[PDB]
Amino acid sequence: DPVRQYLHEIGQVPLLTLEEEIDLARKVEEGMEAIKKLSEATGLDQELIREVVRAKILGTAPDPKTVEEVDGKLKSLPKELKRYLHIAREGEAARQHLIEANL
């Protein structure tokens, strides 16, 4: 019975309060806007930063080259512009939890 398996799995993730629902939706929109301001600072495409942030969050494993060299360039940025890196990371974490809590 795979249906009882999946219902139990989405059962472990508790529902989210209206405060958490506003906070997660906030960090999502903040992260998405943090990505666009990185496409202005660094100069590369939105979807590129989008996937490099998704990688470094949801899983460890070109993997050694293109992914790490883009993240390395992002890590070698001023403090005032590395804020938007951290904001994008937690914003992508917020998207994950927003999805999981509403399955």
Partner: protein
């Protein structure tokens, strides 16, 4: 909860006989030991704004939007007016009864001195920590952490 650091220059008038003479003032010490009650009078006109402090008071006499005189009511000087009253020149605002002191959470520095007969006109620089609580709704997110030293004009929430 935000504990502000508030500072203000305020005027005061007491008899010379009671004034314990100093230049820099600490919280709690005696500023004057009055032999008999004294009526601390307004020297200007306007509407009074009565801000109650920890164990002191501050009278704000204002005409239009500007301020005509900042008034300091030390401990042991009970106000004779109510928040939102009309006063004119010569009307008493507080009665100095007993010996008057500085409030326990307030510091007075840069005191002036103007003696006219038995009366002395003081304008001192006060500093005290005034807490103020703030309510935040779910549609609001806090920006500063616990214990964050903050400055004026900055967004807290």
């Amino acid at each position: 909860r935000v504990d502000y650091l508030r500072k203000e220059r305020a005027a005061l008038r007491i008899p010379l006989s009671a004034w314990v003479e100093k230049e820099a003032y600490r919280p709690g010490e005696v500023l004057a030991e009055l032999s008999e009650p004294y009526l601390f009078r307004a020297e200007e006109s306007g509407v009074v704004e009565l801000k109650d402090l920890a164990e002191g008071h501050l009278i704000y006499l204002r005409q239009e939007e500007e301020v005509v005189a900042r008034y300091f009511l030390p401990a042991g000087m009970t106000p004779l007016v109510v928040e939102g009253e009309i006063v004119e020149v010569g009307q008493p605002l507080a009665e100095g009864k007993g010996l008057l002191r500085l409030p326990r959470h307030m510091t007075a520095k840069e005191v002036e001195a103007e003696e006219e007969g038995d009366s002395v006109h003081l304008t001192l620089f006060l500093e005290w920590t005034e807490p103020k609580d703030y309510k935040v709704a779910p549609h609001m997110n806090v920006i500063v952490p616990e214990g964050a030293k903050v400055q004026a004009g900055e967004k807290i929430v």
